[PDB]
Design a protein around this ligand. Structure first.
Ligand SMILES: [Cl-]
Ligand SMILES: [Cl-]
Ligand SMILES: [Cl-]
Ligand SMILES: [Cl-]
Ligand SMILES: [Cl-]
Ligand SMILES: [Mg+2]
Length: 462
């Protein structure tokens, strides 16, 4: 059931292979070439012959990889701008000769795809998506699960330098003039700007580096609007395209009245995958979906985290409403480090969170889940991003996970015969069955959980 997308842009041509058409497909393979098909289209109306030759040879390799991988589906998409070149129809025929069926996306289709890519990764998004590619900048309004409007501007990476050279304010003038024709910007002020595309992913990675962001995670990385113009000077003083991307981001975000610059790990390709799902599947939480799959493939006994979540959550009914799903995700990942040596499991599980591909998740939630999972695997607390109350909360989550996983041996259906409750500075483990699971190691884990609640522990048989 593996599937592929070939994304033919004005600059980058990319093959991505995914494990299946699911709510959050895993990436099996990724390869790109900077073929620069669109570079000379504005000047001559023609694609360079050298770009055509490179594109065809690399696309032939991508087609061949799809054959040996026995992909069940392969979708090849291109832009209307390249089709519309004087030799664009010829190029598309040459691509057909490879064996590839090329779907040409209009500006509308392409903007819809990038917008739904962001909605796939950030389901409650409400703002403007900017997909900066080689030939164009797509701006897309997203709100309440839907793409609301969009527009395409000729401000791709390959385009910015000619404008900036004209004068100091030429890029600002260009955006000012263009935005007068876009009637929906007025209803989209003071919202996040969701950054999509390779150029702005590189820029966000540069920003994390120069700010010594402790562990840099791309998805949901947030920059203040006043930040891009400063990166222009950072690049200038390090010891071109990056500078152009920062200049465009500064001007665009200011004229949009954007209040935050939010990186999305997902873009046009994930939007195409999302739109291929039926309506009900699109509404599934992608963090929970992917964390569930991870425990299915990684666990000793497949995914046992749902019953674990229901059991431990009798301690956490008063958690902030938005945190239930984070506690849930941690429970779904609670068996995913079992193959590491015991003394490394806490480090290993943290790296699965901090160095994995997860969406539906921001930095604070990543820290909550990682802290809880590390504690669940730690047999030996403060946290810079987390509040003290949430640090304590995550330690309690982790100790409850640890107790439940130890009590059940990981076969969490057995937890249905017990309850774990907090009241009046007492932590009470009640058995209504499976009484034989009581033991000294369970009592030690129970005492540790109680310590995290500043509580005294009791065991009750019912
Ligand atoms: Cl493009
Ligand atoms: Cl591109
Ligand atoms: Cl990309
Ligand atoms: Cl990421
Ligand atoms: Cl313990
Ligand atoms: Mg693109």
């Amino acid at each position: 059931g593996s599937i592929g997308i070939i994304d033919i842009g004005s600059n980058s041509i990319r093959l991505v292979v995914y494990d299946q058409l699911s709510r959050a497909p895993r990436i099996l393979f990724n390869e790109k070439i900077s073929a620069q098909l669109g570079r000379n289209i504005p000047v001559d109306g023609r694609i360079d012959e050298k770009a055509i030759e490179l594109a065809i040879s690399e696309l032939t390799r991508f087609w061949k990889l799809a054959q040996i991988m026995e992909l069940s589906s392969l979708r090849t998409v291109a832009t209307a701008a390249v089709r519309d070149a004087k030799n664009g129809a010829f190029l598309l025929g040459e691509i057909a000769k490879i064996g590839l069926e090329v779907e040409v996306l209009s500006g509308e289709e392409a903007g819809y795809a990038s917008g739904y890519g962001v909605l796939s990764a950030i389901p409650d998004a409400d703002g403007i998506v900017g997909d900066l590619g080689g030939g164009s900048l797509e701006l897309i309004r997203v709100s309440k699960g839907r793409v609301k409007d969009r527009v395409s501007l000729p401000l791709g990476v390959l385009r910015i330098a000619d404008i900036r050279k004209k004068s100091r304010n030429a890029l600002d003038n260009f955006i000012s003039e263009a935005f007068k024709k876009i009637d929906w910007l007025a209803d989209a002020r003071d919202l996040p700007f969701y950054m999509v595309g390779g150029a702005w992913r590189s820029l966000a990675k540069l920003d994390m580096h120069v700010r010594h962001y402790p562990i840099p995670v791309l998805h949901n990385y947030i920059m203040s609007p006043d930040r891009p113009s400063k990166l222009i000077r950072v690049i200038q003083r390090n010891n071109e395209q990056l500078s152009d991307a920062a200049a465009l981001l500064a001007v665009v975000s200011r004229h949009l009245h954007s209040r935050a610059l939010v990186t999305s790990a997902y873009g046009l390709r994930e939007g195409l995958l999302y739109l291929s799902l039926d309506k009900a599947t699109r509404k599934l939480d992608p963090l929970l979906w992917s964390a569930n799959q991870r425990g299915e493939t990684a666990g000793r006994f497949y995914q046992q985290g749902e019953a674990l979540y229901d059991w431990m959550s009798t301690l956490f009914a008063q958690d902030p409403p938005a945190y239930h799903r984070l506690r849930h995700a941690a429970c779904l990942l609670a068996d995913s480090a079992w193959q590491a040596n015991p003394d490394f499991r806490a480090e290993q599980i943290l790296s699965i969170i901090l160095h994995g591909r997860w969406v539906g998740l921001d930095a604070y939630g990543r820290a909550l889940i990682g802290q809880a999972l590390a504690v669940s695997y730690d047999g030996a607390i403060t946290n810079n991003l987390l509040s003290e109350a949430d640090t304590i909360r995550a330690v309690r989550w982790g100790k409850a996970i640890r107790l439940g996983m130890r009590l059940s041996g990981g076969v969490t259906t057995s937890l249905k015969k017990s309850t774990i409750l907090y009241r009046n500075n007492k932590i009470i483990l009640q058995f209504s069955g499976n009484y034989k699971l009581k033991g000294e190691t369970v009592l030690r884990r129970l005492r540790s959980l109680a310590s995290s609640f500043e509580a005294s522990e009791v065991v009750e048989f019912l």
